[PDB]
DNA sequence: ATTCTTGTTTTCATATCCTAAAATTAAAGGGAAAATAAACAATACATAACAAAACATATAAAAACCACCTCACTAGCGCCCCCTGCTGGCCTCTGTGGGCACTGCAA
């Protein structure tokens, strides 16, 4: 949580090198990166959520997910399965996804999907001298690609799940932001989008705040 | 009457021209691997602008240095008794020199 971001960068490799020791051996791969299942990278995600609620210092994890962008860019785009460790009960036999553990992993998804739509640093972070390269840029579409085509799919069941969860609406109406909408006529996702906004509509009828 | 030169058509002849079948050869068409070039994007270098640090000047602020004044010390030479001891006449009291009257003795 440094001020200057190269000191929190160093500071969140080093998390990263640290503290993510389930599946990865810091090693080669077929058993480091995914197990070819939809498991392997669960318990990354649970001390992820662990940190967040222990680091007392901050309400949201913006400078920590900041730190740990470029470290674990691989790990913070596979948003399907923390996904599944939200909503639909994983086959980990885990316990129940606690609700401090669902604003805590709902924040650290706000944190990931801004920074994955938009790549300059928060302020005091910021530098305002950011140039794109061609990587940088296509990177940047086809993320904002998947997200979308993700995002679309997962928020209906997610809002069914935290209709009633005020602030975690709050944080979750953030996303859509950042989501192309010609993908929607090429996708043909509009009933999604319209599921979508029924069930706003009953959050909306719903809460007063 | 018989023999001899000269000019002009006839017909083989030998080079040439034309004709067509082979062959053939170069053009030319297409498949494909190099391949230079070019369009775009990224990196590094150089230039310009802004802000701050460093250098130089003025000024005055104690502050140091030098010279003059002043209040003493240090020499200096009379100044003035003052006391003490020798010296050179001075004078008068003893004392040195002498004239002479006087006496005791024994003629």
């Keep these: 949580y440094s ?10 490799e ?3 090198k640290k503290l993510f020791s389930r599946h990865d051996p810091q090693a080669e791969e ?19 959520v662990l940190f967040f609620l222990e680091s007392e ?4 994890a913006a400078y920590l997910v900041d730190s740990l962008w ?14 599944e460790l939200l909503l639909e009960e994983p ?7 606690s609700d401090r553990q669902e604003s805590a992993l709902i924040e650290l998804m706000v944190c990931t999907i801004r920074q994955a739509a938009e790549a300059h640093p928060p302020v005091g972070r910021g530098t305002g001298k950011r140039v ?11 993320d904002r690609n998947k997200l979308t085509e993700h995002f679309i799919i997962t928020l209906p069941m997610l809002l069914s799940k935290y209709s009633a969860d005020a602030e975690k609406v709050a944080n979750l ?16 996702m509009e009933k999604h989008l319209d599921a979508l906004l029924k069930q706003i509509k009953f959050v909306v009828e719903k809460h007063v705040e």
Aim: net charge neutral; with cysteine.
């Design 132 to 142: 794109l390269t061609a990587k940088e840029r296509k990177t940047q579409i086809d």
């Design 30 to 48: 077929a058993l480091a990166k995914r197990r070819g299942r939809n498991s392997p990278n669960g318990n990354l995600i649970r001390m992820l």
């Design 57 to 60: 210092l901050h309400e949201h």
């Design 173 to 188: 109406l953030q996303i859509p932001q950042y989501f192309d909408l010609e993908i929607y006529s090429t996708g043909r």
């Design 91 to 97: 086959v980990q036999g885990e316990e129940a996804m």
């Design 70 to 83: 470029e470290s674990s860019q691989e790990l913070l785009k596979d948003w399907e399965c923390m996904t």
């Design 3 to 12: 001020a200057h971001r190269p000191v929190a960068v160093a500071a969140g």
């Design 14 to 16: 080093f998390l990263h």
